[PDB]
C-alpha cells in the first residue's frame, strides 16, 4: 500500500509523458509523410492526365 502509492504516480507519469511524446513525434513524422504521399499521388495524377492529353492529341 505504501509503495503502491508511489507506484501509481510512477505509472501515471510514465504513460502520460510517453503518450505525449509519442503523439508529438507522430505529428512530426506525419507532416512529411503526408507530404510525400500527396506529392506522389499528385505526380501519378499528372502522368494520367498527360496520357489523356496524348489520347486527346
Amino acid at each position: 500500500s505504501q509503495t503502491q502509492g508511489i507506484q501509481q504516480l510512477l505509472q501515471a507519469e510514465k504513460r502520460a509523458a510517453e503518450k505525449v511524446a509519442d503523439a508529438r513525434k507522430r505529428k512530426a513524422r506525419r507532416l512529411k509523410q503526408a507530404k510525400e504521399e500527396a506529392q506522389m499521388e499528385v505526380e501519378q495524377y499528372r502522368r494520367e492526365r498527360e496520357q489523356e492529353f496524348q489520347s486527346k492529341q
Partner: protein, 56 residues
Amino acid sequence: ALSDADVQKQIKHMMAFIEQEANEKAEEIDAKAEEEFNIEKGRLVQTQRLKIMEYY
C-alpha cells in the same frame, strides 16, 4: 483477512482508476494527433492542387 483484504481492495480500485485514466488520456492525445494529421493533410492537399491546376 480484513486489513490485508481491504488493502488489496483499495489497490484494485486505484489500479482500475489509473487504468481508466490511462485509456482516456491515451485516446484524447490520439484524437489530438488525428486532428493534427487531418489539418496538415488539408494544407498539403491545397498546396498540391495549386501546382496541379497550374500545370493542367
